[PDB]
């Protein structure tokens, strides 16, 4: 996953989780990348699938 194009004003609500470095499962890439932005670049991907 590349988050350069983010942030995005909105995200579709489909589920395909990612596991962030904060140990939280992101329900989807768009959600995950918007959080990476909101953390100002501090949040990273741990792995695909749930945490």
């Amino acid at each position: 996953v590349d988050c350069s194009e983010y942030p995005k004003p909105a995200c579709t609500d489909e589920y395909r989780p990612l596991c962030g470095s904060d140990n939280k499962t992101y329900g989807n890439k768009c959600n995950f990348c918007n959080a990476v932005v909101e953390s100002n670049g501090t949040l990273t991907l741990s792995h695909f699938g749930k945490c």
Binding site: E5, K8, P9, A10, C11, T12, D13, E14, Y15, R16, P17, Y26, G27, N28, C30, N31, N34
Partner: protein, 185 residues
Amino acid sequence: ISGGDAIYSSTGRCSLGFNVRSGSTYYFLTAGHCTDGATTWWANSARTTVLGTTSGSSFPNNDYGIVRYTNTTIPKDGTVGGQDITSAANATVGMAVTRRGSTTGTHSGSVTALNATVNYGGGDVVYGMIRTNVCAEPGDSGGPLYSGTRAIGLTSGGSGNCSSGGTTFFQPVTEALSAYGVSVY
């Protein structure tokens, strides 16, 4: 299986919108972004229970898709949870609406605007969308938006979450009903 319940495709999870039918042919509406690129749909994560297969999909620009039921045994209730749905209707500013989705359950709110333009990026823009103050999270995509016994729309997306509150855009279900020539039952 009813409105709001989970639906699984090869790619991930979505929520079933409404049970519809034409003649003697049963289908179910859901989000186009979920019908895009899917062929088969199962009732469980295990993919052991087949529901049917994709019959149409419109996304982006719109956000609706239709699935033909191929499962013979599965009960196809014309409900939302156990909420009877008996008609379709146009959303209105100020309307009180309720959403049901496979990840969040039921949440209610109001319609705050019409004809909203939603740009999900990289050319996936959808237009003529209903805006509400209802929240939704991943997996709730395509679930029903209703009011009493009236079907109003299908969950498409938005921002925010259900803890902090958010904004959720839905595709008017009337639009989808017409395009496919189906009806709620």
